[PDB]
Design a protein around this nucleic acid. Structure first.
Ligand SMILES: [Mg+2]
Ligand SMILES: [Mg+2]
Ligand SMILES: [Mg+2]
Ligand SMILES: [Mg+2]
Ligand SMILES: [Mg+2]
Ligand SMILES: [Mg+2]
Ligand SMILES: [Mg+2]
Ligand SMILES: [Mg+2]
Ligand SMILES: [Mg+2]
Ligand SMILES: [Mg+2]
Ligand SMILES: [Mg+2]
Ligand SMILES: [Mg+2]
Ligand SMILES: [Mg+2]
Ligand SMILES: [Mg+2]
Ligand SMILES: [Mg+2]
Ligand SMILES: [Mg+2]
Ligand SMILES: [Mg+2]
Ligand SMILES: [Mg+2]
Ligand SMILES: [Mg+2]
Ligand SMILES: [Mg+2]
Ligand SMILES: [Mg+2]
Ligand SMILES: [Mg+2]
Ligand SMILES: [Mg+2]
Ligand SMILES: [Mg+2]
Ligand SMILES: [Mg+2]
Ligand SMILES: [Mg+2]
Ligand SMILES: [Mg+2]
Ligand SMILES: [Mg+2]
Ligand SMILES: [Mg+2]
Ligand SMILES: [Mg+2]
Ligand SMILES: [Mg+2]
Ligand SMILES: [Mg+2]
Ligand SMILES: [Mg+2]
Ligand SMILES: [Mg+2]
Ligand SMILES: [Mg+2]
Ligand SMILES: [Mg+2]
Ligand SMILES: [Mg+2]
Ligand SMILES: [Mg+2]
Ligand SMILES: [Mg+2]
Ligand SMILES: [Mg+2]
Ligand SMILES: [Mg+2]
Ligand SMILES: [Mg+2]
Ligand SMILES: [Mg+2]
Ligand SMILES: [Mg+2]
Ligand SMILES: [Mg+2]
Ligand SMILES: [Mg+2]
Ligand SMILES: [Mg+2]
Ligand SMILES: [Mg+2]
Ligand SMILES: [Mg+2]
Ligand SMILES: [Mg+2]
Ligand SMILES: [Mg+2]
Ligand SMILES: [Mg+2]
Lengths: 82, 119
RNA sequence: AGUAUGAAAAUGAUUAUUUUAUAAGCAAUCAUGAAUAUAUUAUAUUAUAUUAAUGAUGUACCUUUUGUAUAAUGGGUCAGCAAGUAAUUAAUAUUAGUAAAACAAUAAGUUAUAAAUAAAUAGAAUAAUAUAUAUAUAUAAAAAAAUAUAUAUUU
RNA sequence: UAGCCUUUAUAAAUAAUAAUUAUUAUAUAAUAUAUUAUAUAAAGAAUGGUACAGCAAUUAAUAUAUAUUAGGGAACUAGUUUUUUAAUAAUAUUAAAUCUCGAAAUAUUUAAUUAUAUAUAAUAAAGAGUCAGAUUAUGUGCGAUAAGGUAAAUAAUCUAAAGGGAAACAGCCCAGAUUAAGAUAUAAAGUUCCUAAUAAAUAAUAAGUGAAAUAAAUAUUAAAAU
RNA sequence: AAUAUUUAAAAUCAAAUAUAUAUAUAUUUGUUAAUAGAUAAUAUACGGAUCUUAAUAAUAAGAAUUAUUUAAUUCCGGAAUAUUAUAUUUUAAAAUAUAAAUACUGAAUAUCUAAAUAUUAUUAUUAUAAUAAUAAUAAUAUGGUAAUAGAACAUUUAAUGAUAAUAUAUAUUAGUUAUUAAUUAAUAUAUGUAUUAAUUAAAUAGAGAA
RNA sequence: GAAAGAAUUAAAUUAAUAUAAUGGUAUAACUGUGCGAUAAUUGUAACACAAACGAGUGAAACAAGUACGUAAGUAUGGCAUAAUGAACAAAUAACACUGAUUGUAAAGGUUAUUGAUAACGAAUAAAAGUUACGCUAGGGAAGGGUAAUAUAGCGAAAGAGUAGAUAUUGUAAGCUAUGUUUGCCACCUUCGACUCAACAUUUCCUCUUGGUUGUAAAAGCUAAGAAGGGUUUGACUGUUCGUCAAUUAAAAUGUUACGUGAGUUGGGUUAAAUACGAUGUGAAUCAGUAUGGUUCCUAUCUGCUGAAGGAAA
């Protein structure tokens, strides 16, 4: 399984220790999403920063291309050339 | 004395509601971490996702941090906490040995759950 | 302080459009009515330009400071003038020429071609890579410390 | 000069950052009590003495119809009835910057593994600026448990940071502006009007108490446990 | 109903969690208010208005204070619906909702929608082709004083350098190019006219700050 | 059953350590003793700790020689942490390196050694004051915070009050209020008089009222409401203050940059002259004394006093 982890709260006032905890998880800007193969190491790293992230378990992971495809909005038209 | 840092001594209803939600969110993060570890243990043993979730026996975490965070006596859940300790934090330089949790720096990120038994 | 030209700005008077005599602050931005002007595709229920109805937002600029709307410094306005340049050298980097040589080409000379020592007449594989060799300290000679040289073609 | 910053690069390069496994014990099994395996519990490999806690040794304080020592209080020719002072024992209570017999969390830190590679560390050539700092929290020294005081120790922000909230606001809560757009989810803060946005439950207040900067000892009037 | 310490969740009691299926151990939470004391000097200062509710009584108010909370608690797999918009035809009213496990506002946050630049990958078109230009997709990044590092524009001068009053230069107004700059149109003045476009080399090369 | 051994266990590092304090020490690092006096020796020193540099600290290993030990081995001073000083220039010895035409010299170099720059990373071999005659370049390296002090109230009441803590009174200690005092910090570099005053109430007088063996009357003391009106002339002194004299119902306390100098004064206090007393050798100096003594401004804005014009009536 995978931990889908989202960086919910920012780091503009976070100690450098927790900031490194986050940076070592692959998380970037606020609202960033990453999937992590569930294991004790990542579990502990996320526990130490539980107050700045959101976590949810999932069967499978999604590559950024798939996440983009799911994020793209619905264009309300179909085009026929003339 | 001179500067005006007009921080009121007591929170408002909306602030209290937001604090309750934040506490609940941290509880949810801990719960999800434990559940993920359990499902991983089941899948390593051979089971699949569906009966890993439906398994009657839930595997407890073996790490110190997770075990302690799961103990209510160390990191009590929101519904377990007391109304006093939800909003007021322990200070030894204040009358009543308490101060509003909203006067703690970066209080929406850092977490306090437990104060001394008799304080 | 040449000549000619000169719708360059600051500045003054007058005219035109528009707003303004119940409304209060860096004078501006956005939102939005209304008047006017121009328009040889305004077909219009059009476009653009000018203008303090009205609404919201908005604490001049530099310097120096931990920090300035600051009642801290400097400025009445505009035009012109006003501040990292020269030689003589050393080191580093890039490209270009030539290349175990380069620059000069009258002779010289400067880098490179061998490391080392305060210096001296010492100076790099006994049929191979440091366990060999050179220098300095010590010499029977080695060992020991520090640098440096050797695995068709010399860098 | 070191520290903090910048440009260009180097490989027999992942050496960097973060977390996990380390331990002790129980149960149930095996294997061969001793292991191995699974599950669980414990603030969980090595180092340390702060909080807390304590009065051990040291330094200080209190008490006794209990004892040792000294002057020794109506009869008296050596020996008392005693809420007689001080010291030493006994017992019971206490504290401390330079006291820790107990003892945290954070912390220092080790190998392997996992994650971070559009990423760290180290090294080579070369170029600066800085060496007046300020608040807010938490431990402290000084001051008077004064100061928008002063001196240093951990974050964070301003410095050099626009934007939302704190009425106004360098330093507080949230969040880091390449340029637009404005549909969606929002952070802190709020939803009677000024001003974007709300409907309810259970108790208390009657003092405009209070409603975005809680003023003390005390006094009065009211609430229930036996 | 009378003599009536204390202001308490330690102890007890009551609800819940984790082990336990005939019951126990461990853990978490629940123990008062009002007034007085009160306190200065331009002007009352919750930012201001103002905020406590009440039958008859109309669409229709009753904290905008304090303390716990909900958007039904609830756990670590539930419904409870004055909602508002239905009726056959029934005739004191009548069938059915959405929408409630994530009410609402809210930033230059994040996503979506488009654009620019740099880099890491994959592509397409065109003429160190293992390149160059342009374009397309995924991902990351783009605040900034002191400071460092790339790139470009305006002015003048020197070298090379056609064209020409149907042109050039300058000025004003209105348009175009992602715009410190050039360009297109109209108008005005001067000039048979560029040290011109472009590449180099150089500066008395850019002023609201003395 | 008993002797003599070997010792073991508890306790002890409080004594002792060459010397402060800390850590260590009985397995002793403490003490006694035999040799000895040797390692309180020589040439390379890796690697670490510490660290800007310069310096500092531990030290494996190779080689030469010593002392102790049966041997294993130990010893490169002291159980450890202080016990110190750069380079220049001089001086002494050794080395056999260079010897400015050659030879020797002279002189330099290498190795060892000496003297202290205590403002102790040390300017030079060598150096104190004064300026109120002073000059230039800069920085500022009454308001604001605090409430120790001052003032005021409150709680409690030990004691006075012929009697009774609470008529009055309230002595050490407790809780607060003000920001008028004396100080504290370093964000921010005129005292008095004259004239005119505005504001507060913590009320001096005037009005209403409660208490007072301690209110018979009168005069009082204490307290609650109350800011409408009112609240001084003169001698001394620069004086605010203060001592007096004479009045008054009273002669209250404060805030306003301790109100008011683009409104007046310039007596005190602020420079240039001079003298006295003290300090100093002297220049000169003094929270000393005395005589004299140079700052001005035509009102742009706000505000205010009084006039007018335009206007929407
Ligand atoms: Mg009007
Ligand atoms: Mg005006
Ligand atoms: Mg300053
Ligand atoms: Mg400001
Ligand atoms: Mg001004
Ligand atoms: Mg100014
Ligand atoms: Mg000026
Ligand atoms: Mg040799
Ligand atoms: Mg430097
Ligand atoms: Mg201990
Ligand atoms: Mg201590
Ligand atoms: Mg690793
Ligand atoms: Mg400094
Ligand atoms: Mg300070
Ligand atoms: Mg920052
Ligand atoms: Mg600065
Ligand atoms: Mg800001
Ligand atoms: Mg508000
Ligand atoms: Mg604002
Ligand atoms: Mg109020
Ligand atoms: Mg309990
Ligand atoms: Mg007021
Ligand atoms: Mg953005
Ligand atoms: Mg930038
Ligand atoms: Mg950014
Ligand atoms: Mg110039
Ligand atoms: Mg100019
Ligand atoms: Mg400019
Ligand atoms: Mg100028
Ligand atoms: Mg010794
Ligand atoms: Mg000792
Ligand atoms: Mg180190
Ligand atoms: Mg060094
Ligand atoms: Mg010895
Ligand atoms: Mg010789
Ligand atoms: Mg000679
Ligand atoms: Mg000699
Ligand atoms: Mg000195
Ligand atoms: Mg010194
Ligand atoms: Mg030193
Ligand atoms: Mg001297
Ligand atoms: Mg004089
Ligand atoms: Mg008495
Ligand atoms: Mg007293
Ligand atoms: Mg009064
Ligand atoms: Mg009378
Ligand atoms: Mg005055
Ligand atoms: Mg006065
Ligand atoms: Mg003036
Ligand atoms: Mg005078
Ligand atoms: Mg004299
Ligand atoms: Mg005279």
């Amino acid at each position: 399984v995978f931990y889908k982890v989202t960086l919910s709260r920012s780091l503009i006032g976070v100690p450098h220790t927790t900031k490194s905890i986050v940076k070592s998880l692959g998380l970037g800007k606020r609202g960033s999403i990453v999937y992590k193969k569930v294991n004790p190491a990542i579990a502990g790293s996320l526990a130490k920063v539980k107050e700045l992230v959101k976590v949810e378990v999932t069967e499978h992971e999604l590559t950024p291309s798939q996440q983009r495809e799911l994020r793209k909005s619905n264009p309300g038209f179909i085009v026929e050339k003339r | 004395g001179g500067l005006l840092w007009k921080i009121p001594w007591r929170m408002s209803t909306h602030q209290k509601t937001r604090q309750r939600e934040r506490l609940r969110n941290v509880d949810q993060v801990i719960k999800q971490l434990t559940l993920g570890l359990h499902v991983q243990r089941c899948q390593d043993k051979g089971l699949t996702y569906q009966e890993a979730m439906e398994s009657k026996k839930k595997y407890k975490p073996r790490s110190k941090s997770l075990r302690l965070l799961n103990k209510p006596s160390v990191f009590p859940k929101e519904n377990q906490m007391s109304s006093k300790d939800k909003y007021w934090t322990f200070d030894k330089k204040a009358v009543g040995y308490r101060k509003g949790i909203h006067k703690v720096p970066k209080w929406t990120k850092i977490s306090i759950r437990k104060a001394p038994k008799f304080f």
